[PDB]
Amino acid sequence: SSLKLLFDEFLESYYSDEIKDIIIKFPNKRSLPVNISDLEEFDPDTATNLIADPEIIIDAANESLMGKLAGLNFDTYIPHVRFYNQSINTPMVLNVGSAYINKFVSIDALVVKRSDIRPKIRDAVFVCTFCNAKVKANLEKEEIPKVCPECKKRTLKIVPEESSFFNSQKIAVQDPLERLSGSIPTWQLEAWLDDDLVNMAIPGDRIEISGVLKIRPRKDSRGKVDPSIYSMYLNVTSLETKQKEFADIDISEDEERQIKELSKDPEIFNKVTQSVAPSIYGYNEIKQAVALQLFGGTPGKKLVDGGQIRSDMHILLIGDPGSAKTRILQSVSRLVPKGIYVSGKSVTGGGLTAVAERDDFSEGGWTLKAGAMVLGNGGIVAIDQFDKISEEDTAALHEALESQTISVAKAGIIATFNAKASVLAAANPKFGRFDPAEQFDISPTLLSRFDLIFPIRDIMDTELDKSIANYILNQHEAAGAAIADVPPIEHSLLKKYIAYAKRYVMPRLSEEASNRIKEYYVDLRRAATPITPRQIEGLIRMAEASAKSQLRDVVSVKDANLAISLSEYMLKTL
Amino acid sequence: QQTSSLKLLFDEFLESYYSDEIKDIIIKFPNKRSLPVNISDLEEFDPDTATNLIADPEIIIDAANESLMGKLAGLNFDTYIPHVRFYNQSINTPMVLNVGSAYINKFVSIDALVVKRSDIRPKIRDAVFVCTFCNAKVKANLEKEEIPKVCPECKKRTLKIVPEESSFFNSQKIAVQDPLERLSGSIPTWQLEAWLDDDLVNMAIPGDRIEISGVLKIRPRKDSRGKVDPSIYSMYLNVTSLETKQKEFADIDISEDEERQIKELSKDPEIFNKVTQSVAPSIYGYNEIKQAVALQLFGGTPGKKLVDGGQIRSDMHILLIGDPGSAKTRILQSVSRLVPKGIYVSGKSVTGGGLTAVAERDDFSEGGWTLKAGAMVLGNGGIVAIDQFDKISEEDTAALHEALESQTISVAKAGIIATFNAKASVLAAANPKFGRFKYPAEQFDISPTLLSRFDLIFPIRDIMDTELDKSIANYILNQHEAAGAAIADVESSEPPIEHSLLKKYIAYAKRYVMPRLSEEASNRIKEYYVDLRRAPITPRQIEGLIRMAEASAKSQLRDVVSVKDANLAISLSEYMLKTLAV
């Protein structure tokens, strides 16, 4: 019991508040994530033992947590201690081997496949066919029993109506393609998720998956067992998505205070604005707009007929080569938690607006088709080379930008795929260099969808050129220095702040601001681009975003004036 | 003992709540043998038995069936059996993705897209068995007992089922997943098995969205080589009820109270105006368009046949060509939401994935037919809103002529010659060629021939009136303002007709009202044409006129078409011409 007693101290010390939370929320919340850093700080021997004999250590910790969870019902569910974050055994999926057998390993994983939920028995009950006795067994702690204890015949039959079940699942995992020097490996590591872990590793996610490597006798093409060759499978203990979509970002109580204090900074917006694309000089108006976009407009609005109104914003940059269009796109994609960067050029059936169709000879009955727009999941999809867009994509992006859906009527299925995303597109103009609206090669009906369209021109002011040059060198000098070994807001905080603002601030239009926007519209109508009612919605969106940028629940005329300002800047470049 | 008590509880509950329904089942047995039972009513009667449904569904469902048989004493249950089918609960509403071990042998209700359905497979319930060694007859219900494997008298494994002395009941396997509108990312690579028995069979057609309820079950999982896994199991739902929450116009149910309610609407002079104001609330203006959409929602008199036994189209087709930002998509989308099962689809297609796609015989495909069905084939009489009609593929362009006129798609391919049914009221919308809007007709890339098939073409233009801009601006701002205030539950400042009532009103008018032209109205249209003809106008305009006027009669639950209706058809027609001139 030494270990259990060891863990009792440990758990109480480092995770007492968390354990209390579990006591309240059990069985709905039933797992305790435990950093291994803490455990190695608390007993470096225990932590080292964990890596080489994890099953015995993990069992002890789970028993300790069950003890601290005193007075609760464990007839149906069992508490789980889920250790994560270690750096001793961090192999690549391709390099997992015999050295990690029955050892704890953490791997950077791309989830490729996920199976159906397959109920598995834990507290089992068996009946003897011959002598009718009932034998009980715990399949998570001993092997499936084989003989009746009274008549001694090998005749024990499982009775599932009297046994307990817990979820289980098989996933296929691979190395992220970003970590491979050459061609893709032709195999995937099998992994098993149990209980609450299930359906927490969707295909396409990148998760640090941790657990215990295990082996099993190999079965060949015919199912014939091996002479002495084994296959491998990892039993997962924890799952850490290091980088998390805004909605899944976890904000702590202390962090919640911290974010709120940031709100009171009267320059908070300009700090967010400066973190958009720090590597490039200038383009302050572009950045401001990208900053408004990150926060987005007020979500969850319905029209009188129940038609949901778009909050996400769309921005199209147009310019010549060397206009830092790719770099901005790529930088914004890195800032956002889950960001997509994709080129417009597509092969038919490999578009941005790709959606699954129905194939009876495919797994699940649906083809494995999904483009950037359906994988957006509310984030920013940075589409470079927007001019290269296919005709199929061009037509589908109308609905995708406006309604944030992709509707299909094919193979007897009527469906509307969900395509929420904030597009930051970039396009070079027709015939290379600029001469403004006419030379884009983007449809006028699709341009309408974008809220702000900022054309970028090269004024070639020499003083400006000298400033640019100065900046660029500086960066390089610095980078060089870093190899030699001689920020407005921190990134992590920045994301959390935005996540908080998107989750808990829903700006609502004041009368004064509504009236300012109305006046600007009508004035604009008086006397290249058609100024339809559409533009009014864009001004609402942007203004609402300014409010959400300061964590304010009401749109001011100050907000509306930032929106009208960015509009007018777009308009200045005729 | 406990089962007896349960039977009496159910007797009382069924007399109190479902007396009339049980009597209808007595009259029409076996053709009608299923009693839908809303759980909410069992909530009320004894909440404890309602919780026991979710926890021990099979015990109390078998009890309720037992009771319902008791209430149907005297009827012959040799072939068919009555069924109690519970629905409407909200305690266990899992997603198909997340269904799991917590619901094993428990009641669950799932929002489901049917994807596959199997062949009907007869299955034995009241089975007879005979022994090859001692000729002993063993009887058993196989839904309650397992299959006898060893003869009781002769004690050997020789039992043999006798199909000629056994009873049978239909069974069907269906495949189900979550609606794609509910998934957040990629489609799961799996889909849940469900089983339909007796009268539930062929009530889950591929493509339907049905709230499916039943008891989740487990079966031992088999390997790729048929070897059972040790403690690993597979899931499958034994469906006990199907509730279609959407319901197309014809399947919609109308209570007597509703009938009373609906009729009263009919007497108000401005019902049509009121309806016309329910079409696209979110948009401001577009009244003529709204009026037409309103007339399209009712349609002309169905069942008209020509002297030669042909069919006369009753459904109306509308096209809206306008500039970007002229609210085209929203109207299309709003109308699609209002109608029960509406399709909204883009005109852009790939070869073999068009609006007029139809099945093609193919032996290599499952079932001897390809999985091909577009919006027109799936229209089931609803409104099929096709945006970006200027991007229609040549193949679709050609097939839509016949689909719009004859409401059929005919084919002679793979040795099969047949005519698919494509009944639908299209509400198309297109942008002009070379972007922004001389002769309007030349401005858009649509064949003249295909344009002849629409009854109404509404061009939309910007008249740039400042006051109109002012008016619109106020209108939009007010809308948003209100929505934002609602998110916070503080109000600072209502369809003329409730949505459900409007749906049922239209459904009623479509079932029962069948307008017949009066000579008064007939003459006005009859004259109209000729005068219009003086100084591209064809005879089909008259047909459109008739349809629209008949629809104005149906809009007011009137069996006769008045001249007043004819005038309204003329006015819309007039508007189109005026607008289309130059």
Ligand SMILES: Nc1ncnc2c1ncn2[C@@H]1O[C@H](COP(=O)(O)OP(=O)(O)O)[C@@H](O)[C@H]1O
């Ligand atoms: N303010 C700036 N304006 C323009 N270019 C800049 C600025 N700051 C840095 N650059 C340089 O511009 C180039 C980035 O352009 P990028 O988008 O990658 O190419 P392209 O625009 O043609 O796609 C880089 O050479 C970068 O160093």
Ligand SMILES: Nc1ncnc2c1ncn2[C@@H]1O[C@H](COP(=O)(O)OP(=O)(O)O)[C@@H](O)[C@H]1O
């Ligand atoms: N009352 C109105 N009158 C005119 N236009 C409106 C009105 N209300 C909204 N709009 C705007 O008109 C747009 C409809 O898009 P749409 O015109 O269909 O584009 P396209 O013409 O390219 O299909 C919407 O984005 C909407 O914001």
Ligand SMILES: [Zn+2]
């Ligand atoms: Zn025994």
Ligand SMILES: [Zn+2]
């Ligand atoms: Zn026998």
